[PDB]
Design an enzyme around this catalytic site. Sequence first.
Site, PDB file in Angstrom:
ATOM      1  N   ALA A   9       0.815  -1.281   0.081  1.00  0.00           N
ATOM      2  CA  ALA A   9      -0.073   0.057   0.174  1.00  0.00           C
ATOM      3  C   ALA A   9       0.851   1.261  -0.101  1.00  0.00           C
ATOM      4  CB  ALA A   9      -0.901   0.016   1.247  1.00  0.00           C
ATOM      5  N   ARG A  14       9.343   8.923  -1.336  1.00  0.00           N
ATOM      6  CA  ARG A  14      10.824   9.090  -1.489  1.00  0.00           C
ATOM      7  C   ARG A  14      11.350   8.850  -2.855  1.00  0.00           C
ATOM      8  NH1 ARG A  14      10.322   8.732   4.221  1.00  0.00           N
ATOM      9  NH2 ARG A  14      10.039   6.442   4.006  1.00  0.00           N
ATOM     10  N   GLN A  72      -6.611  -0.358   1.334  1.00  0.00           N
ATOM     11  CA  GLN A  72      -6.173   0.047   2.560  1.00  0.00           C
ATOM     12  C   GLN A  72      -6.498   1.642   3.019  1.00  0.00           C
ATOM     13  OE1 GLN A  72      -2.171   0.588   5.153  1.00  0.00           O
ATOM     14  NE2 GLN A  72      -3.022   1.653   3.789  1.00  0.00           N
ATOM     15  N   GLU A 136      11.201  -0.109  19.011  1.00  0.00           N
ATOM     16  CA  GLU A 136      11.599   0.778  17.872  1.00  0.00           C
ATOM     17  C   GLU A 136      12.366   2.011  18.340  1.00  0.00           C
ATOM     18  N   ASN A 191      12.971   2.543   0.170  1.00  0.00           N
ATOM     19  CA  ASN A 191      12.301   3.472   0.224  1.00  0.00           C
ATOM     20  C   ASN A 191      12.617   4.655  -0.653  1.00  0.00           C
ATOM     21  OD1 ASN A 191      10.441   3.036   2.494  1.00  0.00           O
ATOM     22  ND2 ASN A 191      12.151   3.078   3.815  1.00  0.00           N
ATOM     23  N   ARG A 297      16.355 -10.611 -33.500  1.00  0.00           N
ATOM     24  CA  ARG A 297      15.057 -10.177 -32.999  1.00  0.00           C
ATOM     25  C   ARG A 297      13.964 -11.255 -33.031  1.00  0.00           C
ATOM     26  NH1 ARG A 297      12.913  -5.847 -36.642  1.00  0.00           N
ATOM     27  NH2 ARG A 297      11.267  -5.784 -35.299  1.00  0.00           N
ATOM     28  N   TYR A 330      19.753  -6.598 -44.029  1.00  0.00           N
ATOM     29  CA  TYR A 330      18.408  -6.891 -43.219  1.00  0.00           C
ATOM     30  C   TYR A 330      17.708  -8.104 -43.837  1.00  0.00           C
ATOM     31  CZ  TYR A 330      13.551  -6.592 -41.635  1.00  0.00           C
ATOM     32  OH  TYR A 330      12.351  -6.911 -40.780  1.00  0.00           O
ATOM     33  N   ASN A 350      10.023  -7.549 -47.167  1.00  0.00           N
ATOM     34  CA  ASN A 350       8.969  -8.083 -46.656  1.00  0.00           C
ATOM     35  C   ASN A 350       7.718  -7.470 -46.258  1.00  0.00           C
ATOM     36  OD1 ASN A 350      10.416  -6.573 -44.596  1.00  0.00           O
ATOM     37  ND2 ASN A 350       9.724  -8.058 -43.135  1.00  0.00           N
TER      38      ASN A 350
END
Lengths: 415, 430, 449
Positions: A9, A14, A72, A136, A191, A297, A330, A350
């Site tokens: 969420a 930042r 949320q 914390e 972050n 390719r 090519y 082509n």
Amino acid sequence: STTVIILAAGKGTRMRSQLPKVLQPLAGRPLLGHVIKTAKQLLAENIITIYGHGGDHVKKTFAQENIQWVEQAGTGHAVQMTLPISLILYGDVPLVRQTTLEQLIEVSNKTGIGMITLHVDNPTGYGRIKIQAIVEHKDATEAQRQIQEINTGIYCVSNAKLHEWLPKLSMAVADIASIQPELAFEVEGVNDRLQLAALEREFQKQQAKELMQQGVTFADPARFDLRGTVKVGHDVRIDVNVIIEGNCELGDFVEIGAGCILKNTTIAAGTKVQAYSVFDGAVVGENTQIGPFARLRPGAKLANEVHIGNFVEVKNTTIGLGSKANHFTYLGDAEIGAESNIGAGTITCNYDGANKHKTTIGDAVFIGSNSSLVAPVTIGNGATVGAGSVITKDVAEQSLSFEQQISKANYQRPQ
Amino acid sequence: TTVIILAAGKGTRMRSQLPKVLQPLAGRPLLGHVIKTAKQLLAENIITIYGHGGDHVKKTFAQENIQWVEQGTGHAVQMTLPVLGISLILYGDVPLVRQTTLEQLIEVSNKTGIGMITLHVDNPTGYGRIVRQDGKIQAIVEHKDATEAQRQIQEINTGIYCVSNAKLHEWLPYYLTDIVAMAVADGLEIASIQPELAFEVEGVNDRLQLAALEREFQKQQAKELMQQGVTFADPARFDLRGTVKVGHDVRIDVNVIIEGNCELGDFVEIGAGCILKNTTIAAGTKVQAYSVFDGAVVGENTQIGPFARLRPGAKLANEVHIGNFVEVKNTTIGLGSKANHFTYLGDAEIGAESNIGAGTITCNYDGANKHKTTIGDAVFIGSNSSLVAPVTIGNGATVGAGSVITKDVAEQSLSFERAQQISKANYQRP
Amino acid sequence: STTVIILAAGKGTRMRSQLPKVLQPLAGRPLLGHVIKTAKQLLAENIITIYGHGGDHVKKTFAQENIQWVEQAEQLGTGHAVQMTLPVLPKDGISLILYGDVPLVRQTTLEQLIEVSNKTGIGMITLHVDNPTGYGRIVRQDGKIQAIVEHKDATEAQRQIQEINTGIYCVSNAKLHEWLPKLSNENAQGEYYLTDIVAMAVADGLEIASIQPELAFEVEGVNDRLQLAALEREFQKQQAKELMQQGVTFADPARFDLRGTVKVGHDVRIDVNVIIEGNCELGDFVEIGAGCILKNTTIAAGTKVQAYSVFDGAVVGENTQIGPFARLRPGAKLANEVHIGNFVEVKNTTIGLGSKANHFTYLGDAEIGAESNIGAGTITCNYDGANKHKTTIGDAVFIGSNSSLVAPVTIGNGATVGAGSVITKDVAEQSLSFERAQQISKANYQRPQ
């Protein structure tokens, strides 16, 4: 039945991005995609993703995924929405390994709750960790801040017991297993772009290390990027600044030159790719020689012993055994046989402005230089095409097909 | 405000034929970084002391209104006396000092009449020591002349002073660090600041130090761009040699180099190894690896590369696709047009929704003069066509493959080469 | 007389390679090749190489080298390997004992080792390391070397020794012929340790001389790809440092690779991710752009090479302008003032003074004069399927775009060739040759839908 809960969420302001945080790229894939990939690897019965700001993009990105999405409109408050075993993962902590998460599950099923912890030399600013509590750093007193064992936020709780603790959030031991990850960046979140890049480099470094442990040689493993998967044989040599995307394969003794970029490409044993060749959706045989400055390719298929030189573009074209296009050309929507030679300046026409058409070139054909092959056209075995020709009718086997120079003496060029 | 730049050093460790201040750093000579910073500060006059090789230096900065002076470091500034408000004393070989630092120095120096920039280093060996009694600077003692106790000082002199022009004329009539004690002798209190970044005040003497300063600068530049929100696959494989303006969600792959003044709009993706010089690229464009741009102007949601080469005057409208081994020089390409394959488009004007086949060439040069090729809207140029300028190909026209066009092709018309298919049966090659 | 003995028998299991360990690459050369090169620099009378598993490849790779090969069928120690040299080991003179997987030892170091070992009859190279864990310890009594004790066997006190063994000895052959048959394997591993000759030398009353290398990586071996990459980076870092000490400028010296030798002038500028292979030369004021790769090429003063130009066997004059995306192949010779642009391939072609090929072109097997111009899309059609043929272009020739020159053909001085021409006949001096217009116009054509 194991279900995974992913918190995705965060806006991640930042990042200074218009997209949600979990759609930022890491080794060629959104952060959240890394976690969905690991959760699918765990054979998770259910996967529930909490989205937030910009959730329209996220749901759009993973539409072909059987995920239960939840809006949320805190991290504890965020998980509460899921009530209407389980792992708790973060969309912006993308590199957690399936082996770590299983290791967490085995120890949690015996206890009912587990978590991942990590020892850091410098724990400034992180939450500090029989486990008794987590404090914390913001609210932690000075004494506890000396702990160097930190919290990662990754929990595993039984589906039944989660329902008892989850509403009363205004705790687990009152009614806690732990493991540490094999690599610190497994549990590292991001972050901003600095952290995104530092994690990218940690991931690439570890990926180069694992390839070297498998036996790959790197001219400089710090100048290498894997954005997907690669299967490698023995004696593979990879020069500086190679990038490998999607799912690739490199056979025995394959040598990849400087600056080459491979995406969804297989290259069989013995092939030598010179510098600055790029591949997308190509299949390359054994003992071919490619580059430098070749561009393959999707649909490019080269048989064994084929040579592709510089400033060559191959698109949706199969080239048979031992044929060569050494110079600028090519080749598009073409079928070229074995032991044939494509001259410099040759072009498959082509495209008529609306539809594509096939060029068919046989075995032992020599296409002279500066030729335009107007598809659909077939050029039979052993035929030769004169230089500078525009070819529109089929050329017979063993035939020479070619399409008046005027001289003026003592000509003065404009001044 | 006048800026005095010391640019006389020979820099013999460079083992160069040019004077030290002409060695390159992020795409411009050392002295050019300082002259650029002096101009940002709006210096009324700029006086540069030159030495060995001053002919090259004056020639290099000929279009700059600087007063040159020929040539100890203190003796060097004394020679400027015939030519000097306030003055900054900078070094030509210390190029990365920022204008915000020099402004910060001027604010504290104006209050006293003399200030200086100092720096804390872990190892102060060989540097001049900042001696402070009770917090006030008293003198600067050069490492040679420093007492054993003084060698423990880790605040060192950078040589960057801001002094009043009035007080300078009294002090200048041998080392410049003696101006500090001269200042305390007259009662003035030497102000000081520290730079926000140590490499701002760092000098260079040889190629080793030059490379390390270059890498410090590049690392700091990539960091500042990451703070703005740019994504780097590897910030240690990035080089900025000028300025770049960026939008949000810009992504830059490995070994990109950006030179001159560039612009990257929102959601622009720059692939591996691209090199951009004096080029703007508008929002939504995706550039594949190994595309190089010089003087290019690129619109929105274009697709370029890999191996595209855009040269000055190349202007791409929105939705244009340029593929591999393509060279666009002095050419404008209209909305949504495509040149997916190898081609040279030079001195051309191309309309909208047009298609340029592989092998198309504008023959723009007759050996003496250049001529324009004009291609309209909804034109299809078939492959290997040679367009002999000056020629116009009108809207909706079609050109056959392998055509040589020398006459104007009418609107909605088809022009194709009469190509008789000649066969010789059972042909054996030599 | 100096002989070099190279131990190159290791299988190198952790390389996970099909090749023997000593054929793994380092700066563009097999490990063993670096040591054979240094041995030839020392002017070694003999070179004896001990091979083991895969010696067929090794013998094949260095077949044009006067090497005496010696097999080590079973791996029972380095001393057992050196024992194998006895049938071909000389009686007089000295011998160096080097490792194929220790490739970067410098000749100057080995000379210092020879000079100090000539005084005693036996010397060895040692090295001081911060962490000596896992290394063999140099034991000194009163400062004189007495033995080497392997980390497995070293007491806690001996493990504090930070002087380690490199395995590099310089021994008189006479004393080697006396010591090598009397080597003992009556230990744990059952192997014949080469270090036992140190114990035998001290027993004979000899003093063991020693030197240390100027750079630690000189004596560093490798066992897996990680160690291989770390030594490669150590070597490149040192190579860029020495070039900078000579005065070269690097945009990033950590994004540089030298795989051979390069001679440089003053004020040479080398941008990021440049690779240099074989033997090259860069003159004064040469500028090499990003990502350029040069192999066996000389580039004279003032030339500016733009990014992503690749050269192999090229000779480039002064003040030329090359690239970006130029590809020069062997035999490409550019005079002064030549301009080569993007997507240009030059192979076995000489290009005279001031001539220009600014756009995509293939010039093969061609001789091009001065002040001439090659248009975009020009091709020398040099190959008829069996033989190659030469294209000759004079001075001040203008080759218009998309021209096909079918060799062998000559285009004389001052000639002009129209765009889109196919040239098969010689074009006269001052003459114009062009293709007759054949454009058909049809009005109001609708393309397929």
